[PDB]
Design a protein around this ligand. Structure first.
Ligand SMILES: [Zn+2]
Ligand SMILES: [Zn+2]
Ligand SMILES: [Zn+2]
Ligand SMILES: [Zn+2]
Lengths: 59, 10, 60
């Protein structure tokens, strides 16, 4: 997996958390809720969740 | 997201 | 519409309960991982729903 270099929310560089299922990355401060604590275990980004939810209103 | 305050008895 | 539970899914006690936007479950903010210091502004999907979504993908 080749991850992106800019946050999917604010599009800036920096300390970026990588999504475990897609190439997107995010600043912990740009998540809702924002984190100081890095996620433990598998982490699936907001866009991946949206993707899964979209197919939910379909499936 | 939303919260609610609920007080069940003890 | 949605009918939410009255007890936290983790500890089974009531009080201030964050309601999941996609199922009937509710959770104390301090019963989440990590304990939340704020009420999410937008949509919040609980751990069980997150797992459910994952499982559907792993089987599709
Ligand atoms: Zn950002
Ligand atoms: Zn993702
Ligand atoms: Zn609890
Ligand atoms: Zn849920």
């Amino acid at each position: 997996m080749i991850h992106e270099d800019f946050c999917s929310v604010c599009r800036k560089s920096g300390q970026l958390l990588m999504c475990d299922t897609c190439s997107r990355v995010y600043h912990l401060d740009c998540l809702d809720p924002p984190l100081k604590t890095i996620p433990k275990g598998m982490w699936i980004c907001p866009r991946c969740q949206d993707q899964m939810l979209k197919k939910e209103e379909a499936i | 997201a939303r919260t609610k305050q609920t007080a069940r008895k003890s």
